[PDB]
Design a protein around this ligand. Structure first.
Ligand SMILES: O=c1c2cc(O)c(O)cc2oc2cc(O)c([C@@H]3O[C@H](CO)[C@@H](O)[C@H](O)[C@H]3O)c(O)c12
Ligand SMILES: O=c1c2cc(O)c(O)cc2oc2cc(O)c([C@@H]3O[C@H](CO)[C@@H](O)[C@H](O)[C@H]3O)c(O)c12
Ligand SMILES: Cc1ncc(COP(=O)(O)O)c(CN[C@@H](CO)C(=O)O)c1O
Ligand SMILES: Cc1ncc(COP(=O)(O)O)c(CN[C@@H](CO)C(=O)O)c1O
Lengths: 410, 411
């Protein structure tokens, strides 16, 4: 047996399988993929070099690998209504790198969502390729509502004259009005790129406005609400952008594609075509709203913007005398996994932040219903309220073990 | 199982591709067959963990055990190649090189790299690639009559163009690369030295090819060629100041979350490469390649670029048979022999035709082929290309392929 020859590695993997079983995973960008997705990723497709695209490869022997990639491409067009799909990006970051190369020139001005207001690293950060290569200007959320102020987005567009407007977010819990971004982009002659990585599954289920008809290019990851393997994807409705997208991915920034991962994408896409996937996605949002109700009625946990429309929420934790890294460390000690996160107009350093981010896709996958999501939010509140009270925290751990035992993952 | 009944479209394609790997001679020089341990790591639950950052400095909670896995990969890599620093997060050879350039040069800087038709890779300066687009590449090639690198020409070009960086390493070069000479030339001109050892990393690990890690400022590699690991990249260095620039360039520079299930497979494969048995496998790769070159040298119409090999691969100019590279690729595929077309030095034909094919032995060697089996493979390739689409001879090639694949099953 192969595990006998490398006990150090396989023990660590076994321990990670137990950690996923015994913890409440509340990181908003995580999920648990099906056994079929993992089997695709563990198949012999990892052995095939397949540079190029189906029917135009640079190697012999791709006749069956082309089926796999065709299924991923075609199911993505079916799920999202795009005319063109590229499923080769190794990650969301690569997808966004290629999308920019098809839309703008180095030095061009791009208007993206501010990092502390929900934007992602690849939407302009100075330590990222995006911030180094292009001239990024940020838009945020209104200080009092903590939702996007589209009139201020319009102001920024008019003053800065961006070549491209990016919409989409990592930590924004409200509906994004893509039609408004498109109208604003049209007003100043800018293009529109939407990064729907977080909400892609909700979009496919029809529970969030679809950006594909509005954006020049839509990027996404395959692993968040879509519940697929880690990787990227690029969609468009314009054949001329599709040609630029395809060249930017390969030979532009990538080489061989990961066809075992692409098989996993194809597996996940057909799971998302099943009607059960819409029910899953509805439950995700119902669970999230139920948790927001608990935190709203709780002393010390302020919900940014006061509501959620999707899978995630940001909690301001300052009124409990902790910062984000503390609240995350507290929750880690009771087997509840979140992450620290900046809040709008954040005043602490990124290494501390004032908040945590919570999302329900992973616990929804385990089978949690609204009642259970309510219990999770209550245990999160009690763990944070329990200032140093190991009596209270051990009750939380017991509450966590009740939930995880009720909903086995394996 | 049941999930295969949910999706026959997909699972029937994977089954056909299993049958094709079983029934074909896989002679693509950059492919291999990974172990069931590597595949089980890639099909593990590690795909579920967001682990942005590096071990002990993650941006998410819960990374206790993925840190063990990634640190195993990092440490096994350092032990394998003797490097003080190792980054195992690059998603691919291309991302590894992207990040390495970011740590060494600025946009517009002059870089000297191996010409693509002489054996250099896309990321060594092609103008349709980020490398040629972002930096000023000047190419060195091979001598026309010997078809090996002329190191005086490299020195001349280094001196005329004053590169900030010299890149050595190849994807279609079958001869020993003298990293010491590249280091001399770099020093004389004041340039840094980057070596992309993707193709030969397994041979380097086994001591069958000079090691670039002590000479190069940064060494990059894929994990899936002669190293026989999962599909991915890696960056090695001995300088601590570069290691910090490398780590920053990978994340948050060009990537986000690492693929920790793939990194698990890298740790598996590096351990398999530390086993003494891996050195025996690597030697059989070279012995098999040399046995194939001997056959092609003797046959009429199959000319081996440079007349010999020192490593796992060989380039064959097929023009004297009245075919181009794509036609040869298609003929061979029709008799269950898988290669890729490939440019030859001083390529006269279109990039969509090319003048030759590239053949390498790592995959058939992993199946257990020995030199007498390698000899048979090469004789079959010759027969197929010489059969002016005579079905009787082509079917004898198919029979010969069946014999070898049944003699060395893949399971
Ligand atoms: O800012 C940095 C940063 C700055 C540096 O100087 C440096 O060396 C490294 C850095 O790593 C980062 C890594 C990150 O994941 C994020 C942000 O975390 C949040 C997690 O929910 C997401 O909502 C954001 O989408 C995501 O982009 C970051 O903001 C940063
Ligand atoms: O040049 C192109 C190219 C240009 C385009 O415009 C385009 O759309 C696609 C293209 O795909 C390519 C794919 C390739 O594998 C190669 C080269 O093949 C050989 C090994 O297989 C090696 O000698 C090189 O290491 C390798 O990089 C290429 O040179 C190219
Ligand atoms: C909108 C968007 N686009 C791109 C990416 C990056 O994808 P990658 O990690 O696969 O490279 C992310 C991941 N976002 C991470 C934060 O870095 C998260 O946990 O939410 C994203 O949210
Ligand atoms: C030396 C070297 N460095 C980097 C890469 C890129 O690796 P990637 O495909 O994983 O991105 C390659 C790919 N090698 C391909 C050529 O495209 C091949 O079949 O040989 C390489 O040979």
């Amino acid at each position: 047996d192969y595990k006998t020859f490398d006990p150090d590695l396989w023990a660590a993997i076994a321990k990670e399988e137990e950690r996923q079983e015994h913890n409440l995973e509340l990181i908003a960008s995580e999920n648990f993929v099906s056994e079929a997705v993992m089997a695709a990723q563990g198949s012999i497709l990892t052995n095939k070099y397949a540079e190029g695209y189906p029917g135009h490869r640079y190697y012999g022997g791709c006749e069956f690998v082309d089926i796999v990639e065709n299924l991923a491409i075609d199911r993505a067009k079916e799920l999202f209504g795009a005319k063109f799909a590229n499923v080769q990006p190794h990650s969301g970051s690569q997808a966004n790198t290629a999308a920019y190369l098809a839309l703008v020139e180095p030095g061009d001005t791009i208007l993206g969502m501010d990092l502390s207001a929900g934007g992602h690293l690849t939407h302009g950060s100075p330590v990222n390729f995006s911030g180094k290569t292009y001239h990024f200007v940020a838009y945020g959320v209104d200080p009092t509502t903590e939702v996007i102020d589209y009139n201020v987005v319009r102001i920024l567009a008019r003053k800065h004259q961006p070549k491209l407007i990016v919409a989409g977010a990592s930590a924004y819990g409200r509906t994004i009005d893509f039609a408004k971004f498109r109208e604003i982009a049209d007003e100043v002659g800018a293009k529109l790129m939407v990064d729907m990585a977080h909400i892609a599954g909700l979009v496919a289920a029809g529970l969030h406005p679809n950006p594909v008809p509005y954006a020049d290019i839509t990027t996404t990851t395959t692993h968040k609400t879509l519940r697929g393997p880690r990787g990227g994807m690029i969609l468009t409705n314009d054949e001329a952008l599709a040609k630029k997208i395809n060249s930017a991915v390969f030979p532009g920034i990538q080489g061989g594609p990961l066809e075992h991962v692409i098989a996993g994408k194809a597996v996940a896409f057909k799971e998302a075509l099943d009607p059960a996937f819409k029910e899953y996605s509805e439950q995700i949002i119902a669970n999230a709203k139920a948790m927001v109700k608990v935190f709203n009625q709780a002393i010390g946990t302020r919900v940014i913007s006061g509501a959620t429309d999707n899978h995630l929420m940001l909690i301001d934790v300052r009124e409990l005398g902790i910062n984000g890294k503390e609240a995350e460390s507290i929750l880690d000690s009771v087997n509840i996994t979140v992450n620290k996160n900046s809040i709008p107009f954040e005043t602490l350093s990124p290494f501390k932040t004032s908040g945590i981010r919570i999302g329900t896709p992973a616990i929804t996958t385990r089978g949690f219903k609204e009642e259970d999501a309510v219990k999770v939010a209550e245990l999160v509140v009690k763990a944070l309220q329990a200032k140093d009270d190991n009596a209270q925290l051990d009750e939380v751990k017991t509450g966590v073990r009740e939930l995880t035992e009720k909903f086995p993952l394996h």
